[PDB]
Structure formats: structure tokens, C-alpha cells
Design a protein around this ligand. Structure first.
Ligand SMILES: *[C@@H]1O[C@H](CO)[C@@H](O[C@@H]2O[C@H](CO)[C@@H](O[C@@H]3O[C@H](CO)[C@@H](O)[C@H](O)[C@@H]3O)[C@H](O)[C@H]2NC(C)=O)[C@H](O)[C@H]1NC(C)=O
Ligand SMILES: *[C@@H]1O[C@H](CO)[C@@H](O)[C@H](O)[C@H]1NC(C)=O
Ligand SMILES: *[C@@H]1O[C@H](CO)[C@@H](O)[C@H](O)[C@H]1NC(C)=O
Lengths: 203, 87, 49, 87, 53
């Protein structure tokens, strides 16, 4: 009995990993535990950190599952996998998004910026304009362009008439609020955008 | 009480912590998995009775996977050619 | 022995197609593709004993 | 045979059983998991030989998870500031 | 041998949950079995049914 129960543990251990592989395959991902992935790091020369992005954003497709041996104490199966890999060119690990509020003087005035992302990963800041981006895991974009910071650059100014009161409030995702109000019922300077944080609930 | 800070020119910056990849090209590959139980049986020390307990699990898992896959063929050549279709 | 489980289905198909194309005249197989009992000049190139 | 019912004004109603949330705001948080095997070993009664069987599993699972994560840093402050970058 | 095989069951039990956590993390979800989530129900006052959403 102990001889049998010792071998049963290996069966359970294999069962867990096989179930995980089945879940990953039904999920149109790739289980890299079952695949080597070491041969393609040398064929195309990439860093260790750049290979993780390639591994993470891979999509798979199963086009045949078959059984070749059907003995009572032995079995053999085959799965055909077709998968697609996305090769990157840059990574841009440190990013900041830009929100434009402007000021009102009614007339609402907002400056126009060509760039949308600021990169501080390098020593100098980079200004990136993104086009046709896809939101799957990390942001995937076909084209990103470096542009000048509204200097060696030109920025149009657009002003639109708006009626009073025209108050706008935006949550800041860290608990603060962005307020742009012509009128002032709370202790807030008018006509100037402000960041507001409160200790208790107030209106 | 309230806390304050005046934005100078009405421009604010959001963290936005997700990376941006800027892909270059996309590649496609094919591969076969070849699940076999004899290798696992030999690596362990199964005794002709726990082997049948392993093949049963492998068979049921593989059948469960195979119950939702359509078993088609991958196009690789040219639609016009007749020799490949004849083959 | 060239037909085995260690190969994939496509691999076996390519093996069979190449062997059949090499050892066939018209639609008739060569004697060398048969066992020694089936033909005088048999070399077991395609079948086994 | 057929079954009939005349719609009075040409307006019909679909079940549509999914809920509708109408969000208010979105928040962001950070946290650390701190996976440790000593707590599990102490809670159980491992005997200096099944401990090595537990650390092996924990290590292989954590390495499998770590093989697909890029290990970047979360932006939290202001892009202009030089002191944070110097630090 | 029985002393070893008794402790092996705990290792298997931990392995299952750790694998589930890894799947959830690769899937950009949150495994609430590994996280408390009881402190933020009091900081922001919400009903039991509103916390499930
Ligand atoms: C949510 O994030 C925003 C954006 O960072 C925070 O607003 C900023 O908070 C910092 C920290 O207090 C402010 O810096 C301070 O500026 C004053 C000058 O008025 C200076 O004397 C202090 O020594 C300190 O450096 C910053 O001005 C403020 N506004 C920005 C950057 O536009 C906000 O506090 C965050 N909310 C929470 C609840 O964490
Ligand atoms: C708000 O200002 C008060 C003093 O005016 C200060 O004690 C408190 O820490 C501030 N709250 C913040 C910065 O969140
Ligand atoms: C359709 O009408 C017949 C009688 O006209 C009735 O017996 C049958 O139950 C009806 N089918 C429905 C309501 O699905």
C-alpha cells in the first residue's frame, strides 16, 4: 500500500500542471513552463528584460488535438500550436499623462499640445505622441513620435465662449479633486484651477 | 479643513504607470507538444498499477481539452495551386 | 522502423510521401520495398518482417 | 401550427439581464504580498525533510511567475523634480 | 514514511492555491483569498452587496 501511495503523489503533481496548461490553452495564451523559449533568444538577439515582454504578450491558437497511442498502461497525445509574437523596439517604462484644464476669463481658454506622454526614464525628458494604440496588457502602439516641448514647436490657442457658472470637477485617482470654478461657494479662489483635499465629507 | 495648491498654467500630470511598447513587426510560428506518459512513468518508479492511474488522468484531461477544438488546417502556400490540394 | 510515435503526424506524412515517390514506377512498388519472403530482391525498405 | 401575438405600437422589450453600474470615480492603490515559507512550515509540522520539498515548489512557482514580469517602477511624484531622480 | 507522507499533503494543498494565485495574477485580476479586503470596507462605508461589485 505504501508503495502505491508513494507513486500516487507524482500522478497528482502531474495532474496539477496539466490542468494549468489546459486552462492556459483554452485562454489563448502560452504556457512557457511546457515550452523551452531558449532557442529564440539567440536567433534574435534581445536582452533578458526584452524577452519577458515578448513572452507576456504572445497569443496562441490550437488547430488539432489528436491521440496516437491507446494502450491500457500507455498513452500519447499531440497538440498543434500556432502562435504569434510581437517584437518591440522601445519600452518607455517611466511615463506621465497630460491633463489640460486651462483657465477661464465667459471664455474658456485651453492650450493645445501635440504630445500626450512625458517620459522621464532617461536623464532628459522625452515628449511622445502616440497613434492607434491597443490596450491589451501593456499598451501596444504601432507608431509613437518624439516631438518638441511646445517651444522649437508651435502650439495653437483655442478659446470658446461658455455660460456661467461652468464649474468642472475631476477626480484625481489619489483622493484629490481638480476644481475649475468661476463662482466660489467654498473657500476656493475663482477663475484658477485648484487641487482640493478634504479631511471629512463636505459639499 | 481643505488643502490647496494652485496650478500655474492649467496643465496637470497623471501617473499613468502602464508601459508603452511601440511594436516593430509580428511573427508567426508553429509547434507540436507531443504529450507522452512513458517518459513520466520512467522518470518516476511506477509499478504497473499506478501506470494505469496515470494514463486515466492524462486521457481524461486530454479529452476535455479536445472536446472544444475544431481540428482544422493551417494555410501555408498559395490559393491558386492545384498540386497541394490534390496531394 | 521509420514509422514511429516519436515523430509528429506531418513528419510521418513527409516520410511516407518521400519514400513512396522514391520507390515506385507508375503505381507499382519496387521489390526492394518488400520483405525477403514477399519478393526475391526484398530489402525491407518500406515494410518489415 | 403557429402562435401569435400582435404588438400594439411596434415597441418590444428585451430581458437584458446584465446590471448597469454607473461608476463615480476610480482609485489606485499599492500593496506587497510577502510570500514566506517559514510561516507555513511552522503552522504545519514539517520535519527538516519535507521543508525542502516545500521550498522547491515555492521556488519553482515563483520563478515561473517572475519569468514574465518586467520589474519596473511606479511613478508617484512630479516629472520636473531632480532630487527624486538623483536619489 | 508515514511521517513524511502526512506532511506532503500540506505541500500539495499549498501548491494548488499558489497555482491559482499565479493564474489570477497573470490574468490581471485580484485573488481576494490572499488579500484581506476588510479594512477598506470601513474606510469607505459601503454595503455588503456593494463591496462584491
Ligand atoms: C495627489 O497627487 C497630487 C499630484 O502630485 C498631489 O498634489 C501635490 O501634492 C504635493 C505634496 O504636498 C504638493 O507639493 C507641495 O507643494 C508646496 C507648494 O504649494 C510645497 O511648499 C510643499 O513642500 C510640497 O512640495 C504639490 O504642490 C501638489 N500639487 C501639484 C503637484 O500640482 C496631491 O497632494 C495628492 N493627494 C494625496 C491625497 O496624496
Ligand atoms: C492640510 O493643511 C493642514 C494645515 O493647513 C495640514 O496640517 C495637513 O497635513 C494638510 N493635509 C494634507 C497635506 O493632506
Ligand atoms: C400555440 O397555440 C396552440 C393552440 O392554438 C396551443 O395549444 C399551444 O400551446 C401554443 N403554443 C405556445 C403558446 O407556445
Amino acid at each position: 500500500d505504501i508503495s502505491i501511495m508513494e507513486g500516487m503523489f507524482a500522478v497528482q503533481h502531474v495532474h496539477t500542471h496539466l490542468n494549468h496548461l489546459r486552462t492556459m490553452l483554452m485562454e489563448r495564451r502560452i504556457d512557457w513552463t511546457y515550452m523551452s523559449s531558449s532557442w529564440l533568444q539567440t536567433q534574435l538577439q534581445k536582452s533578458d528584460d526584452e524577452m519577458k515582454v515578448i513572452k507576456r504578450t504572445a497569443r496562441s491558437l490550437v488547430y488539432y488535438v489528436k491521440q496516437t497511442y491507446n494502450s491500457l498502461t500507455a498513452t500519447a497525445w499531440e497538440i498543434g500550436l500556432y502562435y504569434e509574437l510581437i517584437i518591440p523596439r522601445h519600452i518607455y517604462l517611466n511615463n506621465w499623462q497630460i491633463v489640460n484644464i486651462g483657465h477661464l476669463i465667459l471664455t474658456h481658454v485651453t492650450l493645445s499640445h501635440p504630445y500626450e506622454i512625458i517620459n522621464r526614464e532617461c536623464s532628459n525628458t522625452l515628449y511622445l505622441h502616440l497613434e492607434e494604440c491597443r490596450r491589451l496588457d501593456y499598451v501596444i502602439c504601432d507608431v509613437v513620435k518624439i516631438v518638441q516641448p511646445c517651444g522649437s514647436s508651435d502650439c495653437p490657442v483655442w478659446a470658446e465662449p461658455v455660460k456661467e457658472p461652468h464649474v468642472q470637477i475631476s477626480p484625481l485617482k489619489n483622493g484629490s479633486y481638480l476644481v475649475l470654478a468661476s463662482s466660489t461657494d467654498c473657500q476656493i479662489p475663482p477663475y484658477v484651477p485648484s487641487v482640493v483635499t478634504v479631511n471629512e465629507t463636505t459639499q | 479643513e481643505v488643502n490647496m495648491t494652485s496650478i500655474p498654467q492649467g496643465v496637470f500630470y497623471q501617473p499613468h504607470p502602464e508601459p508603452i511598447i511601440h511594436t516593430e513587426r509580428v511573427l508567426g510560428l508553429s509547434q507540436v507538444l507531443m504529450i507522452n506518459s512513458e517518459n513520466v512513468a520512467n522518470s518516476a518508479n511506477l509499478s504497473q498499477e499506478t501506470k494505469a492511474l496515470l494514463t486515466e488522468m492524462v486521457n481524461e484531461e486530454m479529452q476535455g481539452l479536445s472536446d472544444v477544438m475544431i481540428d482544422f488546417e493551417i494555410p501555408l502556400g498559395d490559393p491558386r495551386d492545384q498540386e497541394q490540394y490534390i496531394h | 522502423k521509420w514509422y514511429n510515435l516519436q515523430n509528429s503526424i506531418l513528419q510521418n506524412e513527409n516520410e511516407l510521401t518521400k519514400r513512396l515517390s522514391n520507390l515506385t514506377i507508375g503505381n507499382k512498388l519496387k521489390n526492394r520495398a518488400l520483405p525477403y519472403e514477399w519478393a526475391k530482391g526484398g530489402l525491407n525498405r518500406l515494410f518489415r518482417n
